[PDB]
Ligand binder design. Structure first.
Ligand SMILES: Nc1cc(C(F)(F)F)c[nH]c1=O
Lengths: 351, 13
């Protein structure tokens, strides 16, 4: 076989240890999910906008009492109601409260006021993978692999809790002071025991079954991992066009082309992740995540060492101080206006 | 030719 019978026994013991870990992690998650830390806006100084989206923005804030810096996501309640996003915003808060994993951003506070919802999370000063990747062009395969391994372990954790993530992309992956990945933006994360039906995500990263309005499962995250690995190693994603409709047509087609510098091991992995046929997609078969973890492209990956953060990272962001924003791009700064009248109170009773 | 800037999520197709 590929492994001697001893190496095979080591791998087996390793896989049983994973099951033991995930069983404990489920017990801890459920304790928090059933029986869940507020603050208020004037407890923080607002420093700088770190990112912007349809419903609001993320701001660097400084907690007045402690001097700690955080990233505060601000959502305009009226804009959230205007869409099927009420449920999604409640999903994000509830999931972030309850999960615990080294590569998942930690939520510190949440609160709401007349106009907005607020989630205050750990500030990750190394910046988005997105801007490092766009600056350097593409990551070498070892560098991409180090990040990919952290996503594989994070999805193994989330999926074991019946959580789908649904928005993997470099924009949502921050680099910490040790060069490891922090996954952010749980706005589309959801507890799903079997299938779900919402058309949501980011065009370049959507699995075909989402685009085709089919009920879908956690395998959409494994497709998205294929897109991410391709983009990290190529510098651009596999289904690449100026308009969403053109992107969707490429995704459904069942065709991918690879740069000539991709190793054959990488291409083989990607053909099995970017697999339209769900009966053949890695991560969706009888052996589950182990088809990915045991793939040749990951043969050098020490999964436990990655989890334990023992591996030297390929890139350490420059860090000048705890509130330094030099690794983030600039955004237009807008006033944070709070209405004197409560908006959408009944819709957000549970937040 | 494709999108090189930050990509926004979609809530409906
Ligand atoms: N820039 C950051 C954004 C987030 C967020 F979760 F996406 F909101 C967390 N921490 C950051 O440093």
């Amino acid at each position: 076989g590929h492994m001697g019978n001893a190496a095979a026994a080591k791998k087996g013991s390793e896989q049983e240890s994973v099951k033991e870990f995930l069983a404990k992690a489920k017990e801890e998650f459920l304790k928090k999910w059933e029986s869940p830390n507020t603050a208020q806006l004037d407890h923080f100084d607002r420093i700088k906008t770190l990112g912007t989206g349809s419903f609001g923005r993320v701001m660097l804030v400084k907690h007045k009492e402690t001097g700690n810096h955080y990233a505060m996501k601000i959502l305009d309640k009226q804009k959230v109601v205007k869409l099927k996003q009420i449920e999604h915003t409640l999903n994000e808060k509830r999931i972030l409260q309850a999960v615990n994993f080294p590569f998942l951003v930690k939520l510190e506070f949440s609160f709401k006021d007349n106009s907005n919802l607020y989630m205050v999370m750990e500030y990750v000063p190394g910046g988005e993978m997105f801007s490092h990747l766009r600056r350097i062009g593409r990551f070498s395969e070892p560098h991409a692999r180090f990040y990919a391994a952290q996503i594989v372990l994070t999805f193994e954790y989330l999926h074991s809790l019946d959580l789908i993530y649904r928005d993997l992309k470099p924009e949502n992956l921050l680099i910490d002071q040790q060069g490891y990945i922090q996954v952010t933006d749980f706005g589309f994360a959801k507890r799903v025991k079997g299938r779900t039906w919402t058309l949501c995500g980011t065009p370049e990263y959507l699995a075909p079954e989402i685009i085709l309005s089919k009920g879908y499962n956690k395998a959409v995250d494994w497709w998205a991992l294929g897109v991410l690995i391709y983009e990290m190693a190529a510098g651009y994603p596999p289904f690449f066009a100026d308009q969403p409709i053109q992107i969707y047509e490429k995704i459904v087609s069942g065709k991918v082309r690879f740069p000539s510098h991709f190793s054959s091991d990488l291409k083989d992995l990607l053909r099995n992740l970017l697999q339209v046929d769900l009966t053949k997609r890695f991560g969706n078969l009888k052996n589950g995540v182990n088809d990915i973890k045991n793939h040749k492209w990951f043969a050098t990956t020490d999964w436990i060492a990655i989890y334990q953060r023992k591996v030297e990272a390929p890139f350490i962001p420059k860090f000048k101080g705890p509130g330094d924003t030099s690794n983030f791009d600039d955004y237009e700064e807008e006033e944070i206006r709070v209405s004197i009248n409560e908006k959408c109170g009944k819709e957000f009773t549970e937040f | 030719a494709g999108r090189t800037g930050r990509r926004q999520a979609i809530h409906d197709i």
